[PDB]
Structure 1
Amino acid sequence: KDEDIFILTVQPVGIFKGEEFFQGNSMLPSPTEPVFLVEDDILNKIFSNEKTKIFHLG
Structure 2
Amino acid sequence: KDEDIFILTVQPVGIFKGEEFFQGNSMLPSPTEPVFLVEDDILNKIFSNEKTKIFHLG
TM-score with structure 1 setting the length: 0.77
Q: Which moved more, 1:22-31 or 1:6-15?
A: 22-31
- Of Structure 1 and Structure 2, the greater strand share is in 2
- In 1, the alpha carbon distance for the partners of 2:18 and 2:9 equals 25
TM-score with structure 2 setting the length: 0.77
Aligned identity (percent) is 100
Partner of 1:44: 44
Q: CA deviation at 1:14?
A: 0.7
Partner of 2:11: 11
Q: CA deviation at 1:53?
A: 1.8
Spell out the pairing of 1:14-33 with structure 2 (5 A cutoff). Answer: 14-33=14-33
Q: Which moved more, 1:8-17 or 1:24-33?
A: 24-33
- Unaligned ranges ≥5, structure 2: none
Change (3 A) 1:25 1:52: closer
- In 2, the alpha carbon distance for the partners of 1:16 and 1:50 equals 16
Structural RMSD (CA): 1.7
Partner of 2:53: 53
Query: Could you list the runs of 4 or more consecutive aligned residues of structure 1 that deviate by over 6 angstroms after TM superposition?
Result: none
Q: CA deviation at 1:13?
A: 0.6
